[PDB]
Structure formats: structure tokens, C-alpha cells
Scaffold this active site. Structure first.
Site, PDB file in Angstrom:
ATOM      1  N   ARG A 162       3.464   2.566 -10.971  1.00  0.00           N
ATOM      2  CA  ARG A 162       3.748   1.136 -11.155  1.00  0.00           C
ATOM      3  C   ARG A 162       3.758   0.739 -12.639  1.00  0.00           C
ATOM      4  NH1 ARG A 162      -0.451  -0.906  -6.402  1.00  0.00           N
ATOM      5  NH2 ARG A 162       0.253   0.667  -4.866  1.00  0.00           N
ATOM      6  N   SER A 163       2.801   1.255 -13.415  1.00  0.00           N
ATOM      7  CA  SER A 163       2.730   0.929 -14.854  1.00  0.00           C
ATOM      8  C   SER A 163       4.011   1.352 -15.572  1.00  0.00           C
ATOM      9  CB  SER A 163       1.524   1.620 -15.498  1.00  0.00           C
ATOM     10  OG  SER A 163       0.272   1.053 -15.081  1.00  0.00           O
TER      11      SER A 163
ATOM     12  N   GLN B 141       6.610   7.902 -10.518  1.00  0.00           N
ATOM     13  CA  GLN B 141       5.967   8.965  -9.731  1.00  0.00           C
ATOM     14  C   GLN B 141       6.782   9.440  -8.538  1.00  0.00           C
ATOM     15  OE1 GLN B 141       2.080   6.736  -9.213  1.00  0.00           O
ATOM     16  NE2 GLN B 141       1.219   8.787  -9.414  1.00  0.00           N
TER      17      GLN B 141
ATOM     18  N   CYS C 200      -2.494   0.684 -13.524  1.00  0.00           N
ATOM     19  CA  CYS C 200      -2.555   0.710 -12.069  1.00  0.00           C
ATOM     20  C   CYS C 200      -3.706   1.644 -11.705  1.00  0.00           C
ATOM     21  CB  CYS C 200      -1.188   1.089 -11.486  1.00  0.00           C
ATOM     22  SG  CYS C 200      -0.338   2.571 -12.233  1.00  0.00           S
TER      23      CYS C 200
ATOM     24  N   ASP D   3       0.826  -1.213   0.000  1.00  0.00           N
ATOM     25  CA  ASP D   3       0.000   0.000   0.000  1.00  0.00           C
ATOM     26  C   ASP D   3       0.863   1.268   0.000  1.00  0.00           C
ATOM     27  OD1 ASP D   3      -2.569  -1.271  -0.010  1.00  0.00           O
ATOM     28  OD2 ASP D   3      -3.174  -0.426   1.907  1.00  0.00           O
TER      29      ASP D   3
END
Ligand SMILES: O=C(c1ccc2c(c1)NNS2)N1CCOCC1
Length: 282
Positions: free
Chosen positions: A221-222, A262, A215, A181
């Protein structure tokens, strides 16, 4: 510089935030006018994440052709990817329309439906064989065929039917279920194992349309997934694998979608993944 020793040099000097801010400063800026039209407000999850006009995927519809999705075309590596946001309640039909029209074999999902107690994307595929889904706005039917649950990821076989023509196709759903998370994984081993399972399925290969990867926003994440895949492929193709520059590859990918990677922690994790992966390939 090479990668593994550039890596230790940034760790010892603690300058990951400065490296990452340089990337942010040098990244391309292209218009995203279609994304910002008022009629598309409920088609975007986040107001600050939009596809560029020049690389956006168009739906084959004359009313409204807009979806928050981008084509990342890597010329030297000879790989293409579609990066998209997690579907919204009012875009699940558009999502499967895109999969159909672009001739994709595989969908790669890097988030859970609920994270941090909030919804990160719609429940856009069926959970039981006998309870199929019909998307009336785009005239598609989607059935769960089989499901294989493993410790770090789940693979599903899905049948997508175009109800207008009665044509059917098999779609593979690759769901990485264990990204934490907060932060990034401590080791890249399970993420790399997952990447290799997607590769082995054929979903990334030129005989199919581009893989669809998402995502929640479709940039963090992508971005890590496609950056690691392309860097490892280039290390196999070139005479000198130490010439592959992960920062230059990331800036090339950011010509096609804004914001890929990110955080500085995601940048460090991408380096780690490519470094460990390059040892297993040989
Ligand atoms: O890159 C991989 C990897 C994984 C699976 C296969 C592979 C390479 N090559 N064929 S299958 N790693 C990285 C180190 O820790 C885990 C495994």
C-alpha cells in the site's frame, strides 16, 4: 505506450502477472547488511523486508542508529518520501525520534492496527486528549490535540515535544481506514481523495522534511501511495503527459526500497488510480 490504452491492452490480454514478474526481475538489488545484524532482529517486522544500506534512515544515536525505514528521493518530480514498516512494541520510540529528527510534518498510515484477526502494528499514538504518551527511551512526549473522523479516513492533530529541549511541533496524522483486508479497492476514488487531502495540508511540500508513510511492511500500500503521487506530479510538469511511464517510475523508486508494489493486483490498482486522477486534475 500511453497509459490508458496500455491498460486496456493488458486487461484484454490478461497479462498482469507477466508484466509484474518482469518488474520483479529487473528491480535493483543492493546490500542491506545493517538490517541483518543480530542486534537488530527485534527491530524488523518481516525477515524478507529490509532497507538498503545506501538509502536507510539513520537515527541520531551512537548506540544503535538502526530503524527499518528508507528515503525515496525522486529527482525529476522534486518529491521525497520516507517509507517505513508499521512500528513494533520495541520501536515506537524510534519511530517518533525519526519523525522529530527528519523534520516531517505528516505521517500517512494505510493499515488498521488489527487486520485479518492479527496485529499489523503497535498502537503508537494516543486515543484520548487527556491520556498522553511518553517514550522514555527517546525522551519524547506525544499528545492528541484533535481528531476528525470521516467515512474513508481520519485526520488527527498531534503535538510532539522533545523533552530534552522543551521544543514542540504540530504533526498531522492521515489515516486511511478502509483498505480491504483482502485485495485492493474496487474504485480508486476514495484513495485519490485521500491523497489530495494529504497534499492540501502541506505535508508533501519542500518547506518540510519528507512525509513518513507506512502500512504493515511499508512496501505494498505504501508503494501505491508514493507511485501514484509522483506519476500525477510528473504529468503536470512535463510538456507531454503521455510520456510518463509508470513501470519506469516504479523501477526508479525500487532503487531506494525493495519490493514496492507487492502483487499484480496492486500494480493494476496503481494504473487505475493514475488514469482517473489525471482527469480530475484538469
Ligand atoms: O484525482 C482525483 C482527485 C481527487 C480530489 C481532487 C483532485 C483530484 N484534484 N483536486 S482535489 N480523483 C480521481 C477520480 O475520482 C475521484 C477524484
Amino acid at each position: 505506450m500511453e497509459m490508458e490504452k496500455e491498460f486496456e491492452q493488458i486487461d484484454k490480454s490478461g497479462s498482469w502477472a507477466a508484466i509484474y514478474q518482469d518488474i520483479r526481475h529487473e528491480a535493483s538489488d543492493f546490500p542491506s547488511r545493517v538490517a541483518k545484524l543480530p542486534k537488530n532482529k527485534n527491530r524488523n517486522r518481516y525477515r524478507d523486508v529490509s532497507p538498503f544500506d545506501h538509502s536507510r534512515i539513520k537515527l541520531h544515536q551512537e548506540d544503535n542508529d538502526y530503524i527499518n525505514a528508507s528515503l525515496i528521493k525522486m529527482e525529476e518530480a522534486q518529491r521525497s518520501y520516507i517509507l517505513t514498516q508499521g512500528p513494533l512494541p520495541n520501536t515506537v520510540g524510534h519511530f517518533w525520534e525519526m519523525v522529530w529528527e527528519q523534520k516531517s510534518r505528516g505521517v500517512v498510515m494505510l493499515n488498521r492496527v488489527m487486520e485479518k484477526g492479527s496485529l499489523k502494528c503497535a498502537q503508537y499514538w494516543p486515543q484520548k486528549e487527556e491520556k498522553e504518551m511518553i517514550f522514555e527511551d527517546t525522551n519524547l512526549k506525544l499528545t492528541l490535540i484533535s481528531e476528525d473522523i470521516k467515512s474513508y479516513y481520519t485526520v488527527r492533530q498531534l503535538e510532539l515535544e522533545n523533552l530534552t529541549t522543551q521544543e514542540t511541533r504540530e504533526i498531522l496524522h492521515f489515516h486511511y481506514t478502509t483498505w480491504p483486508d483482502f485485495g485492493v479497492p474496487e474504485s480508486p476514488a476514495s484513495f485519490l481523495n485521500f491523497l489530495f487531502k494529504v497534499r492540501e495540508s502541506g505535508s508533501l511540500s519542500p518547506e518540510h522534511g519528507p512525509v513518513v508513510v507506512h502500512c504493515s511492511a511499508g512496501i505494498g500500500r505504501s508503494g501505491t501511495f508514493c507511485l501514484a503521487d509522483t506519476c500525477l506530479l510528473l504529468m503536470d510538469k512535463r510538456k507531454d503527459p503521455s510520456s510518463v511511464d509508470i513501470k519506469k517510475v516504479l523501477l526508479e523508486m525500487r532503487k531506494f526500497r525493495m519490493g514496492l508494489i507487492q502483487t499484480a493486483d496492486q500494480l493494476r490498482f496503481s494504473y487505475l488510480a493514475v488514469i482517473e486522477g489525471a482527469k480530475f486534475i484538469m
